[PDB]
Amino acid sequence: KGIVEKEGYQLDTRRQAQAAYPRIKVLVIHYTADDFDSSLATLTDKQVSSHYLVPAVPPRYNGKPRIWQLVPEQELAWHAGISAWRGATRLNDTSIGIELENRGWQKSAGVKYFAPFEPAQIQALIPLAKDIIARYHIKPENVVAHADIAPQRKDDPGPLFPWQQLAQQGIGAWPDAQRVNFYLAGRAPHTPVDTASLLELLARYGYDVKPDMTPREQRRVIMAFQMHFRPTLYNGEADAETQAIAEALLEKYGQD
Ligand SMILES: [Cl-]
Ligand SMILES: [Zn+2]
Ligand SMILES: [Zn+2]
């Protein structure tokens, strides 16, 4: 018995389709580049928003870190902008955005330095990320960086964001070391490798790769990937190790 009275008609809900699935498929990670109070004001203006805001060191109550929610999950937030991941565009529509309070980068004697993420912030992020993934059956290759989906425009969350520590906790994609090793084929890690080959691999993993991009545009794409997946060097140049890693990721998780 599922008969709902509506105005002008009634609804029989006793028969339920098997082909029914979530509208949320992707979880997206950001940094605020600002203090908490500025961030908060900004994420609640009329230009941008997000679903969660995590302070740099969450305050505790009941013995529990407090995280702020600004948009209810069932609705979209304006966080991703112009974006593209694994064949999808308009990523606001199909994603949840978490904002973390972090400084980002600044030039410090002309040298583009990034700011590290507090243990206490990650500790709070874990439980939340886990709940969201479980709720919507999000797949690990779809836990991403803002930069992963907007490679020409965004850097966040940057190379100091601990993707690997999180993978150990069933949070987001990460290759098997053995298989990376295999795919290196005993080349030295920094051995130059065909640029176009690497882009083809990157496009198929999910990166927005257009035909006829400028050498600068090609570097941004490779650079984005390196910040997530090989943070020791992210100069956007193509090399044996970078390719090995993409090769290993497409093996473990595929093209969707
Ligand atoms: Cl209170
Ligand atoms: Zn962002
Ligand atoms: Zn309050």
Short mmCIF file of C-alpha atoms and ligand atoms in Angstrom, two decimals:
data_model
loop_
_atom_site.label_atom_id
_atom_site.label_comp_id
_atom_site.label_asym_id
_atom_site.label_seq_id
_atom_site.Cartn_x
_atom_site.Cartn_y
_atom_site.Cartn_z
CA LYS A 1 0.00 0.00 0.00
CA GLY A 2 1.62 3.22 -1.29
CA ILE A 3 -1.24 5.43 -2.38
CA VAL A 4 -0.50 9.14 -1.88
CA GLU A 5 -3.33 11.69 -2.11
CA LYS A 6 -2.31 14.65 -4.21
CA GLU A 7 -4.15 17.74 -5.38
CA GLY A 8 -5.84 16.77 -8.69
CA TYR A 9 -4.61 13.13 -8.82
CA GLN A 10 -3.28 10.27 -6.71
CA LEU A 11 -0.11 8.18 -6.88
CA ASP A 12 0.46 4.43 -6.76
CA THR A 13 3.96 3.71 -5.40
CA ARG A 14 3.62 -0.07 -4.86
CA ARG A 15 5.72 -0.88 -7.92
CA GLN A 16 9.34 0.17 -7.70
CA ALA A 17 11.92 0.08 -10.51
CA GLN A 18 15.30 -1.63 -10.14
CA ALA A 19 16.91 0.91 -12.45
CA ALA A 20 17.10 3.67 -9.83
CA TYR A 21 20.35 5.39 -8.78
CA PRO A 22 21.79 8.44 -6.99
CA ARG A 23 22.15 11.80 -8.71
CA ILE A 24 25.34 12.34 -6.68
CA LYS A 25 28.41 10.64 -8.21
CA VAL A 26 31.44 12.84 -7.33
CA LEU A 27 32.97 14.32 -4.17
CA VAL A 28 35.12 17.46 -4.62
CA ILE A 29 37.93 18.87 -2.40
CA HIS A 30 38.83 22.60 -1.98
CA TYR A 31 40.88 25.03 0.07
CA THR A 32 39.51 28.45 1.13
CA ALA A 33 42.71 30.52 0.90
CA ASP A 34 41.32 32.63 3.81
CA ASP A 35 40.52 32.64 7.55
CA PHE A 36 37.33 30.93 8.77
CA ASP A 37 35.18 34.03 9.18
CA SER A 38 35.97 35.43 5.74
CA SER A 39 35.53 32.00 4.15
CA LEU A 40 32.07 31.64 5.86
CA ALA A 41 30.85 35.07 4.74
CA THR A 42 32.06 34.32 1.18
CA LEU A 43 30.53 30.82 0.88
CA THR A 44 27.19 32.35 1.93
CA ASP A 45 27.19 35.36 -0.49
CA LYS A 46 25.30 35.46 -3.81
CA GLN A 47 28.28 34.48 -6.03
CA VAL A 48 29.54 31.14 -4.62
CA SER A 49 28.74 28.37 -2.12
CA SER A 50 29.70 24.89 -0.86
CA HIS A 51 28.15 21.96 1.10
CA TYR A 52 30.69 21.74 3.92
CA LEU A 53 33.26 24.02 5.50
CA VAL A 54 35.88 22.45 7.81
CA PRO A 55 37.85 24.73 10.13
CA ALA A 56 41.68 24.49 10.17
CA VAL A 57 41.43 22.99 13.65
CA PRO A 58 37.75 22.08 14.37
CA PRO A 59 36.40 23.05 17.84
CA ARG A 60 35.30 20.10 19.99
CA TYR A 61 32.00 19.37 21.75
CA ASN A 62 30.74 16.14 23.31
CA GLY A 63 34.31 15.16 22.33
CA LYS A 64 33.53 15.68 18.61
CA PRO A 65 34.93 18.05 15.91
CA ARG A 66 32.35 20.54 14.68
CA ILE A 67 31.97 20.88 10.86
CA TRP A 68 29.70 23.49 9.22
CA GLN A 69 27.07 22.63 6.56
CA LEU A 70 25.87 25.47 4.32
CA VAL A 71 23.91 23.67 1.57
CA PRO A 72 21.67 20.62 2.03
CA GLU A 73 23.00 17.65 0.04
CA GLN A 74 19.88 17.10 -2.09
CA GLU A 75 20.52 20.57 -3.63
CA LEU A 76 23.43 21.82 -5.74
CA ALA A 77 26.08 24.32 -4.56
CA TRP A 78 28.05 26.76 -6.68
CA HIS A 79 31.57 25.44 -6.04
CA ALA A 80 33.01 23.67 -9.10
CA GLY A 81 32.32 26.21 -11.89
CA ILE A 82 33.24 25.37 -15.47
CA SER A 83 34.42 21.75 -15.07
CA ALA A 84 34.88 18.30 -16.73
CA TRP A 85 35.50 14.85 -15.30
CA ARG A 86 35.28 11.40 -16.95
CA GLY A 87 32.96 12.54 -19.73
CA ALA A 88 30.81 14.79 -17.55
CA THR A 89 30.65 18.56 -17.61
CA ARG A 90 28.76 20.99 -15.24
CA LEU A 91 30.02 19.22 -12.11
CA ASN A 92 27.96 21.30 -9.69
CA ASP A 93 24.98 19.21 -10.82
CA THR A 94 26.34 15.83 -9.83
CA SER A 95 28.78 16.54 -6.95
CA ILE A 96 29.24 17.48 -3.26
CA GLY A 97 31.75 20.18 -2.39
CA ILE A 98 33.86 20.19 0.79
CA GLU A 99 35.82 23.39 1.58
CA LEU A 100 38.81 23.18 3.94
CA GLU A 101 40.31 26.24 5.64
CA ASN A 102 43.84 26.46 4.30
CA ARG A 103 46.07 29.27 3.07
CA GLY A 104 46.93 27.76 -0.33
CA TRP A 105 50.10 29.11 -1.91
CA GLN A 106 51.96 32.41 -1.76
CA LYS A 107 55.17 33.67 -3.32
CA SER A 108 57.73 33.83 -0.51
CA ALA A 109 60.91 35.37 -1.94
CA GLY A 110 59.51 34.76 -5.48
CA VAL A 111 59.19 30.98 -4.70
CA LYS A 112 55.59 29.56 -4.97
CA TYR A 113 55.25 27.85 -1.53
CA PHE A 114 52.17 25.87 -0.35
CA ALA A 115 50.71 25.61 3.20
CA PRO A 116 50.38 22.24 5.03
CA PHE A 117 47.16 20.67 6.30
CA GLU A 118 46.67 20.22 10.05
CA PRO A 119 46.30 16.67 11.43
CA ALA A 120 43.13 17.80 13.26
CA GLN A 121 41.51 18.89 10.00
CA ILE A 122 42.11 15.52 8.32
CA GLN A 123 40.92 13.62 11.46
CA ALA A 124 37.56 15.37 11.11
CA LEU A 125 37.47 15.03 7.32
CA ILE A 126 37.82 11.23 7.39
CA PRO A 127 34.43 10.40 9.08
CA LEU A 128 32.53 12.85 6.88
CA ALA A 129 34.10 11.72 3.60
CA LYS A 130 33.32 8.12 4.61
CA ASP A 131 29.64 8.82 5.29
CA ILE A 132 29.14 10.67 1.99
CA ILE A 133 30.81 7.92 -0.08
CA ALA A 134 28.73 5.22 1.70
CA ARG A 135 25.49 7.17 1.27
CA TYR A 136 25.80 7.73 -2.50
CA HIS A 137 27.97 4.74 -3.51
CA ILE A 138 30.72 7.12 -4.74
CA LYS A 139 33.58 5.33 -6.55
CA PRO A 140 37.21 6.06 -5.52
CA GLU A 141 38.24 7.50 -8.88
CA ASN A 142 35.49 10.06 -8.25
CA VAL A 143 36.94 11.54 -5.08
CA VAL A 144 38.80 14.48 -6.71
CA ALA A 145 40.68 17.76 -6.48
CA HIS A 146 39.03 20.97 -7.63
CA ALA A 147 42.09 21.14 -9.95
CA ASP A 148 41.45 17.61 -11.31
CA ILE A 149 38.25 18.90 -12.99
CA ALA A 150 39.29 22.51 -13.77
CA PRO A 151 42.97 22.00 -14.71
CA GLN A 152 43.45 25.38 -16.44
CA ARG A 153 41.93 27.42 -13.58
CA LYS A 154 42.41 25.87 -10.14
CA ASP A 155 45.25 24.53 -7.96
CA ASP A 156 43.29 23.37 -4.87
CA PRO A 157 43.85 21.40 -2.79
CA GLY A 158 47.54 21.39 -3.97
CA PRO A 159 50.54 18.94 -3.52
CA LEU A 160 50.62 19.00 0.31
CA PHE A 161 47.13 17.61 0.53
CA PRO A 162 47.55 14.01 1.82
CA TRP A 163 45.82 11.89 -0.83
CA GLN A 164 47.69 8.69 0.03
CA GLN A 165 47.07 8.72 3.77
CA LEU A 166 43.38 8.93 2.82
CA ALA A 167 43.46 6.03 0.37
CA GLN A 168 44.59 3.76 3.24
CA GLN A 169 41.18 4.59 4.72
CA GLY A 170 39.10 3.69 1.64
CA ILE A 171 38.97 7.39 0.65
CA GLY A 172 39.74 7.99 -3.02
CA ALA A 173 41.84 6.26 -5.71
CA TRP A 174 45.51 5.14 -5.42
CA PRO A 175 47.52 2.59 -7.43
CA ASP A 176 49.19 -0.65 -6.29
CA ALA A 177 52.93 0.00 -5.86
CA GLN A 178 53.80 -3.38 -7.40
CA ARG A 179 51.90 -2.53 -10.58
CA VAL A 180 53.48 0.92 -10.88
CA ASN A 181 56.84 -0.85 -10.57
CA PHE A 182 55.79 -3.22 -13.35
CA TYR A 183 54.72 -0.38 -15.62
CA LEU A 184 57.99 1.54 -15.15
CA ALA A 185 59.61 -1.39 -17.01
CA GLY A 186 62.91 -0.58 -15.30
CA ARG A 187 63.28 2.89 -16.75
CA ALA A 188 64.69 5.54 -14.39
CA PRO A 189 61.69 7.53 -12.89
CA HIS A 190 62.50 10.89 -14.60
CA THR A 191 63.25 9.51 -18.08
CA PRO A 192 61.49 11.71 -20.68
CA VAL A 193 58.44 10.03 -22.27
CA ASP A 194 56.22 10.99 -25.27
CA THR A 195 54.02 13.96 -24.19
CA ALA A 196 51.03 13.07 -26.42
CA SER A 197 50.95 9.45 -25.15
CA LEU A 198 50.63 10.72 -21.60
CA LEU A 199 47.80 13.08 -22.46
CA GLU A 200 45.90 10.20 -24.11
CA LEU A 201 46.24 8.25 -20.87
CA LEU A 202 45.14 11.29 -18.83
CA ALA A 203 42.10 12.09 -20.97
CA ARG A 204 40.88 8.49 -20.55
CA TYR A 205 41.38 8.61 -16.76
CA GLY A 206 39.15 11.73 -16.56
CA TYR A 207 41.22 14.81 -17.38
CA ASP A 208 39.79 17.49 -19.65
CA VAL A 209 42.02 17.19 -22.74
CA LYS A 210 41.13 19.19 -25.89
CA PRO A 211 42.67 18.76 -29.34
CA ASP A 212 45.37 21.32 -30.22
CA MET A 213 46.31 22.73 -26.81
CA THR A 214 49.26 25.06 -26.29
CA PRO A 215 52.46 23.80 -24.60
CA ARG A 216 51.38 25.82 -21.51
CA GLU A 217 47.90 24.16 -21.57
CA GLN A 218 49.49 20.69 -21.90
CA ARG A 219 51.65 21.40 -18.81
CA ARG A 220 48.71 22.53 -16.69
CA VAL A 221 46.93 19.20 -17.39
CA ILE A 222 50.00 17.08 -16.53
CA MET A 223 50.77 19.45 -13.62
CA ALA A 224 47.28 19.01 -12.14
CA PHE A 225 47.69 15.20 -12.20
CA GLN A 226 51.17 15.30 -10.61
CA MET A 227 49.91 17.40 -7.64
CA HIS A 228 47.37 14.63 -6.86
CA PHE A 229 49.29 11.54 -7.83
CA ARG A 230 53.07 12.25 -7.76
CA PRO A 231 53.59 15.37 -5.59
CA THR A 232 57.42 15.23 -5.31
CA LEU A 233 57.69 16.92 -8.74
CA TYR A 234 54.84 18.72 -10.49
CA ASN A 235 56.56 20.75 -13.24
CA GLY A 236 54.14 19.38 -15.85
CA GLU A 237 56.81 17.50 -17.83
CA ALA A 238 56.13 13.93 -18.98
CA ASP A 239 58.30 11.10 -17.57
CA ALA A 240 58.49 7.32 -17.09
CA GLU A 241 57.16 7.43 -13.49
CA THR A 242 54.21 9.76 -14.21
CA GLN A 243 53.09 7.48 -17.07
CA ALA A 244 53.58 4.29 -14.98
CA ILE A 245 51.19 5.74 -12.42
CA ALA A 246 48.47 6.62 -14.90
CA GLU A 247 48.95 3.20 -16.51
CA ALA A 248 48.39 1.55 -13.09
CA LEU A 249 45.34 3.67 -12.23
CA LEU A 250 43.52 2.85 -15.51
CA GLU A 251 44.27 -0.79 -14.83
CA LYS A 252 42.72 -0.76 -11.34
CA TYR A 253 39.72 1.54 -11.89
CA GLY A 254 39.17 1.82 -15.70
CA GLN A 255 37.47 4.61 -17.81
CA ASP A 256 34.39 4.68 -15.54
CL CL B 1 26.40 25.60 21.19
ZN ZN B 2 38.35 25.12 -5.38
ZN ZN B 3 27.36 29.01 14.90
#
